[PDB]
Amino acid sequence: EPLRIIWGTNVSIQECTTNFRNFLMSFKYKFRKILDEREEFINNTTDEELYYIKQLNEMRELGTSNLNLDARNLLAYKQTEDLYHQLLNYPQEVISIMDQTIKDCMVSLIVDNNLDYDLDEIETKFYKVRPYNVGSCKGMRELNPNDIDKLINLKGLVLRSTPVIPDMKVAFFKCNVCDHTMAVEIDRGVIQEPARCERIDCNEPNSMSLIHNRCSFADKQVIKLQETPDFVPDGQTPHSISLCVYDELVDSCRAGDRIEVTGTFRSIPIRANSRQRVLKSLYKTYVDVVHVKKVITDQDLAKIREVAAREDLYSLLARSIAPSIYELEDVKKGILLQLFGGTNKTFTKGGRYRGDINILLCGDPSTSKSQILQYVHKITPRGVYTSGKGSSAVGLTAYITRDVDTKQLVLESGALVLSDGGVCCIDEFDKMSDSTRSVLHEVMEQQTISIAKAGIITTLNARSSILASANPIGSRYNPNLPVTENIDLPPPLLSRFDLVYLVLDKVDEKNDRELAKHLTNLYDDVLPVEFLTMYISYAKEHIHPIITEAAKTELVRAYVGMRKMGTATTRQLESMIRLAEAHAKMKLKNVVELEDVQEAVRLIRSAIKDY
Amino acid sequence: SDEINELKEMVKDEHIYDKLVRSIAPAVFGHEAVKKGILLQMLGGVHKSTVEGIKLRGDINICVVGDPSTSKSQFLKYVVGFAPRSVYTSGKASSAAGLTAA
DNA sequence: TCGTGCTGAGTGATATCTGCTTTGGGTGGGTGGGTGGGTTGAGGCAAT
DNA sequence: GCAGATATCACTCAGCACGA
Ligand SMILES: Nc1ncnc2c1ncn2[C@@H]1O[C@H](COP(=O)(O)OP(=O)(O)O)[C@@H](O)[C@H]1O
Ligand SMILES: Nc1ncnc2c1ncn2[C@@H]1O[C@H](COP(=O)(O)OP(=O)(O)O)[C@@H](O)[C@H]1O
Ligand SMILES: [Mg+2]
Ligand SMILES: [Zn+2]
């Protein structure tokens, strides 16, 4: 009875397998809570259930071959305390054992439960475990030779990833004489080639050839990770570490993302020259990744639908979008309606119509303009905080360049293009040369940018909302002169903006007193931002308002009345349509009512301000 | 044969000219002169080469000037979406090259 | 009924042999060195 | 002096037919 043992140690593999099988078979999350001194938080439904059994059953129903594992869960159990150390110190063997045990557990679950599930699908499926949360996150500048071939945890920023690389798994050989085909495995990157044909009648030596296109292959990719800027001790070039990901984890992390990766810190020789077995004494270090983490339920939907019933929903959201800003309810309301956006229309026999709202916030300096810009910049999922005189005409739209790795002509995405589907933010609109402003003419009108220069003729979608701010020519705003004089900017440009607000810092004995009491307390409830983001995302994805006849009957009246009192062009009517659609989105309605359009027109007249 | 029959039925109508004028750029509202210009541009003119060898142009160029917020770009988008061969370019983005041989 | 000496056949280890550069390019360097060589031109973009 | 691709020679083994 030979005993299987991991090389260089005294751990019996059968013990590991049985312990892991027992842990998977009988584990309840209550143990995890007990371990962390959270005994009083134990419930009676989720913590009294077989966790990994439900995980495996869900895997089977969804047809997946992955089970994410938590090491702290291993520490929680009784029989797998030593398994945690074994996994930490000998990751490869323990990981393989865990994968095989997971497959065996699935097979046993199917067989014992007497289910009708066919065994073929599970039998031919490769199962892999992806442990994470394996201890403290080591730094990229603290990996020593001592920590070679051990499971570590890293965090960094993705810099560049190579395309998919095919990695051979099983080779295929065919005899040139008898046309006999056999498949041989690959061990440690070496093909166990046969010397002569395996058949008995035919034994011609050296007659076997490799059929390149019939060998099984896997997926390989190489990533470069740069340490977070914070870890840099004294402002030098941040270090980088290479990573390898296979099978599912391929194409899981994009360039320019913050990730936390668990893997084995491996070492490998480098050959001195191509045509010799000679090796350099210095080894290359890299990480073999086994897990990657990029750093709606019915209950939430039932909760969200409860807020919509609230009569004062408009005020609640307007007060929660920017908690700190004081007494700017109309400005907040206008800002909020931009996040929701109008309604999207797909339209053949013409062109697409997009419900995107553009807002201008021009007023006296000390008023909270930039603060609102930053506040909205945080909420939106995509956006670029471009400023005045810090951005260029090309920089906003797109830059033509070349890819050194591929040696091909490529184009980058500018600030406006990078904000596709978000809300762009501009701080100093007046302090911007008119040459660059001409770019925004097409963005706000056609929602697209077309470039034709140096052999590149293509159009990039820029379906983004613009939120810009401007300051008066003088030190303050003078009410006496008209708007077109105080704020600069071409008169026609001001007409493009859907809403153009005017916030001024008047002097009073009570407004100033209340503002001072509000900005000094730093040394009327508001929804948590986490829930608000989900609310706006759900509204933006599911709901799609459709105008009604009552809306049109009075929208014609409103537009004609706006034009009669006299600047007022068709863009104002389209803005009214977009705003009415957006407000209906807030209340989760599929039809735009008279009240919503009334609110839209109310907002428009009271923005420029009702002298 | 069926398409030919439809074509000859089209030609037979004595109100063809205004019918085509109305059909062009249906999304835009009542701009008869501009639609007529776009139609005539699409049809084009006969190009000829004299006994000399010098070539007389046969194509038509049209420039639509208007105040912002008017229906200018709508016509251009319609032409791009209808003409057999055509491209869309912007004044600011375009350069000497790209708009010509590079 | 059977045992053994002679033969052709085929690997194993070992003998000579060629080669020991190689290569255009800056994530191959300049403590590898110029007797191993590298000699644009248009177009785009920031600064102003 | 050193690694790799290549071809050379020598030694030993399983079959065969005959004689015991
Ligand atoms: N209504 C207000 N609510 C909260 N803070 C305010 C208000 N008005 C002024 N402030 C304060 O005054 C400062 C104005 O600066 P800033 O918002 O950068 O002005 P701007 O961006 O228009 O130049 C902010 O730091 C803010 O704390
Ligand atoms: N007659 C019209 N018919 C349909 N839509 C119109 C009409 N006039 C104006 N519009 C709408 O008003 C918007 C503003 O026109 P725009 O394309 O900005 O003109 P410009 O090309 O001068 O910028 C357009 O997107 C268009 O949809
Ligand atoms: Mg500001
Ligand atoms: Zn064979």
Distance separating alpha carbons of residues A179 and B77, to the nearest angstrom: 62
Secondary structure letter of residue A238 according to DSSP: P
Distance separating alpha carbons of residues B27 and B4, to the nearest angstrom: 28
B98 contacts A452? CB cut-off 8 A: yes
| Same domain as A277, residue A148 | yes
Secondary structure letter of residue A263 according to DSSP: E
How determined?
Answer: cryo-EM
| Same domain as A141, residue A210 | yes
CA distance B49 to chain A (A): 32
N residues, chain A: 611
What Cα–Cα distance (Å) separates residue A48 from each residue in A33, A69, A574? Answer: 12, 19, 58
Distance separating alpha carbons of residues A65 and A367, to the nearest angstrom: 56
Dist. CA A379 → ligand 3 center (Å): 18
Q: Which residue range forms the structural domain that includes residue A44?
A: 3-136
Residue A523 makes CB contacts below 8 A (sequence gap 6+) with none
The structure was resolved to a resolution in Å of: 3.5
* Strand intervals (E) in A71-150: 128-132
N residues, chain B: 102
A454 contacts B97? CB cut-off 8 A: yes
Ligand 1 atom with the shortest distance to the CA of A365: 22
What Cα–Cα distance (Å) separates residue B23 from each residue in A290, A403, B16? Answer: 62, 47, 10
Quick check: CB of A374 below 6 Å from ligand 1? no
CB A300 within 8 A of CB A293: no
Residue A255 makes CB contacts below 8 A (sequence gap 6+) with A158, A159, A160, A161
A396 nearest nucleotide via C1' and CA: C45
| Same domain as A16, residue A125 | yes
Distance separating alpha carbons of residues A87 and A90, to the nearest angstrom: 5
| Same domain as A288, residue A148 | yes
Dist. CA A208 → ligand 4 center (Å): 8
Which residue among A350, A445, A452 sits closest to B27, beta carbon to beta carbon? A350
| Same domain as A266, residue A175 | yes
| Same domain as A108, residue A167 | no
Category of A114 on φ-ψ map: left (φ > 0), alpha (ψ -120 to 50) or beta = left
What Cα–Cα distance (Å) separates residue A40 from each residue in A33, A34, A602? Answer: 9, 9, 53
Residue B31 makes CB contacts below 8 A (sequence gap 6+) with B25, B71, B75
| Same domain as A168, residue A115 | no
Give phi and psi for A125, each to the nearest 5: -95, 135
Q: Looking up tokens 């995980």, which residue turns up? A: A55
Q: For strand C, is any atom closer than 7 Å to the CB of A203?
A: no
What is the β-pairing status of strands A165-175 and A208-210? antiparallel
Q: Looking up tokens 């004489």, which residue turns up? A: A177
B98 contacts A457? CB cut-off 8 A: yes
Residue A524 makes CB contacts below 8 A (sequence gap 6+) with A319
| Same domain as A167, residue A117 | no
The b/e string for A416-431 (b: 16+ C-beta within 10 A; e otherwise) is bbbbebbbbbbbbbee
Nearest chain B residue to A395, by CA: B93
Structure tokens at B77: 């988008």
For the CA of A518, the nearest ligand = 1
Structure tokens at A223: 């990533």
B78 contacts A350? CB cut-off 8 A: yes
Secondary structure letter of residue A509 according to DSSP: T
Nearest chain B residue to A451, by CA: B93
Binding site for ATP: what residues of A are annotated?
Answer: 363-370
Tell me the CA end-to-end span of chain B in Å, nearest whole number.
46
Distance separating alpha carbons of residues B98 and B56, to the nearest angstrom: 26
Binding site: what residues of A are annotated?
Answer: 363-370
Distance separating alpha carbons of residues A130 and A164, to the nearest angstrom: 21
Angle ∠(B25,B31,B36) on CA atoms, nearest 5 = 70
Distance separating alpha carbons of residues A187 and A171, to the nearest angstrom: 11
Distance separating alpha carbons of residues A492 and A495, to the nearest angstrom: 5
Q: For strand C, is any atom closer than 7 Å to the CB of A453?
A: yes
| Same domain as A40, residue A122 | yes
Residues from A contacting B (CB-CB < 8 Å) are 349-351, 393, 397, 435, 438-439, 441-442, 445-446, 449-457, 459, 492, 495-496, 569-571
Q: Is A481 helix (H, G, I), strand (E, B) or coil?
A: coil
Distance separating alpha carbons of residues B53 and A389, to the nearest angstrom: 55
Quick check: CB of A324 below 6 Å from ligand 1? yes
CB A92 within 8 A of CB A148: no
What Cα–Cα distance (Å) separates residue B28 from each residue in A70, A246, B38? Answer: 62, 55, 13
| Same domain as A61, residue A185 | no
Q: Is A244 helix (H, G, I), strand (E, B) or coil?
A: strand
Distance separating alpha carbons of residues A205 and A216, to the nearest angstrom: 25
Angle ∠(A227,A233,A236) on CA atoms, nearest 5 = 75
| Same domain as A211, residue A264 | yes
| Same domain as A198, residue A274 | yes
A277 nearest nucleotide via C1' and CA: D3
